[PDB]
From Swiss-Prot:
It is found in: Cell membrane. It is a multi-pass membrane protein. Glycans are attached at N168. One of its GO terms (cellular component) is synapse. Residues 1-15 are annotated as: Required for response to orexin-A. The N-terminal region is required for orexin signaling. Keywords: Cell membrane, Disulfide bond, G-protein coupled receptor, Glycoprotein, Membrane, Receptor, Transducer, Transmembrane, Transmembrane helix. Belongs to the G-protein coupled receptor 1 family. Nonselective, high-affinity receptor for both orexin-A and orexin-B neuropeptides. Triggers an increase in cytoplasmic Ca(2+) levels in response to orexin-A binding. The chain holds residues 35 to 383 of 444 of the full protein. GO terms for molecular function: neuropeptide receptor activity; orexin receptor activity; peptide hormone binding. This is Orexin receptor type 2. GO terms for biological process: cellular response to hormone stimulus; chemical synaptic transmission; circadian sleep/wake cycle process; feeding behavior; locomotion; neuropeptide signaling pathway; phospholipase C-activating G protein-coupled receptor signaling pathway; regulation of circadian sleep/wake cycle, wakefulness.
Amino acid sequence: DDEEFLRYLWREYLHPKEYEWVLIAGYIIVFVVALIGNVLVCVAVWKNHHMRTVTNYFIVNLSLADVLVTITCLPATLVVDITETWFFGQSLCKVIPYLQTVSVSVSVLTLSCIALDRWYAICHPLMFKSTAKRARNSIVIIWIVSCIIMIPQAIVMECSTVFPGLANKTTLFTVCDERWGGEIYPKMYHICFFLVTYMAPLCLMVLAYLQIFRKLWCRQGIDCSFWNESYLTGSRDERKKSLLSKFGMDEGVTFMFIGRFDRGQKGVDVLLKAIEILSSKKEFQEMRFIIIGKGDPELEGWARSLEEKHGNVKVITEMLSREFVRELYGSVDFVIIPSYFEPFGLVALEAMCLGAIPIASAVGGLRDIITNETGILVKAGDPGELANAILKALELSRSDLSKFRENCKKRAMSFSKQIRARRKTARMLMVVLLVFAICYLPISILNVLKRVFGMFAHTEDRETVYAWFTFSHWLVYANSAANPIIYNFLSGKFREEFKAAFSCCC
Ligand SMILES: CCN(Cc1cccnc1)C(=O)CN(c1ccc(OC)nc1)S(=O)(=O)c1ccccc1C
């Protein structure tokens, strides 16, 4: 009667759309999934101390922004897309678009700081001393910048009431939309809006992740299935004696260098000078040197001269197969890596996997790999320091070295594990970036085409354009539901925490 009469009146007022059933269904699904998932992300990182990383701090910030828009903006957007009218008054006409755009800005700047942190950690040779307070300062900056830059958005939003009807106005409708005082202002503002919220951060993040991919996959990594001691037969003593026998050398503490002969990069000049220095001491007779490489013909001549002079020095300018090099690593006592510059100690990791104790310059990746219990670090470029470290290694070799070789093997495996873990994380972040870029493409392009280029002004098919806009709105909100699913599929820690959450209630 009376209650049915009022429902009837709004039905006569509001004209329904044929696709609103799937829109409502999709919004309800995205609402529940985004809410539950992002809440679980937050509680997973907050209640479990193993989740405390800078990346996960940024991920929590992203989930918070997403929860904000899911609770305060998604219902309003659904209602407006269904009814094409603003029922919530003037203040909410300001506030809700402000919250929405602020959350977009927070999201894109959070992804940007994620990309930047990974780039500094991976592509930059240095590392930040601060991790947690760095993330906190970044997050506060992100929110402050986001809230400030979207102030114009809130300023231009206005309620406007339109009175349809020929002569006497019996009905009206209020819309919430941007109010501009000219044709140039919306074009300029929405060009800037597209640049700041979508295009420029996307380009920067794509460049950063290209550099990160190139570093993590093409410039790093060691084939652990090949560089493995399981392929070696017999004990290390037997292999060393067989090696020295085949090389026409007496038994002794065996040092190996492998690399290009150059001046200022791989450091064979430092090694040859250190060998000349050691040649005057009696300990030199207890030592054997295997110098493998090619390059500078003057350094090749110097090395051959040392070989012709000393029976405990052998130089190999021939190209050796990887199986032979693996035999070398698994039988020599020490590998000498006197690089001036060494961004990735690949030789060091390959040698340590096979139990060879590295003696390396403290430069770059060698510093990252080698510790005081897994090798000997020397000042780069100093032949006297290198000779002293070689004498130190001889004195060490007078006793059992097996614990040092085991520490080298464990450290190399652990480093390879870190490399793989960083690869998995970078991959998850790249998927997140790709899904963000897809989810926000339609609305970004449609906003430019409407505001900057003025399309859809006099369109014959306005129903199609309105469907495209409602779809782009929903796709934006579905991004918030998609992120936790991504974390569950591409992160074993998030997956375990989600399983624990869903099991504590079942
Ligand atoms: C200028 C902002 N914009 C363009 C845009 C480009 C890229 C990312 N988000 C929005 C709009 O289309 C408008 N904005 C919007 C609309 C729907 C929606 O669904 C996710 N998200 C944002 S809005 O200004 O916040 C707005 C305006 C009027 C009523 C409600 C809302 C939320």
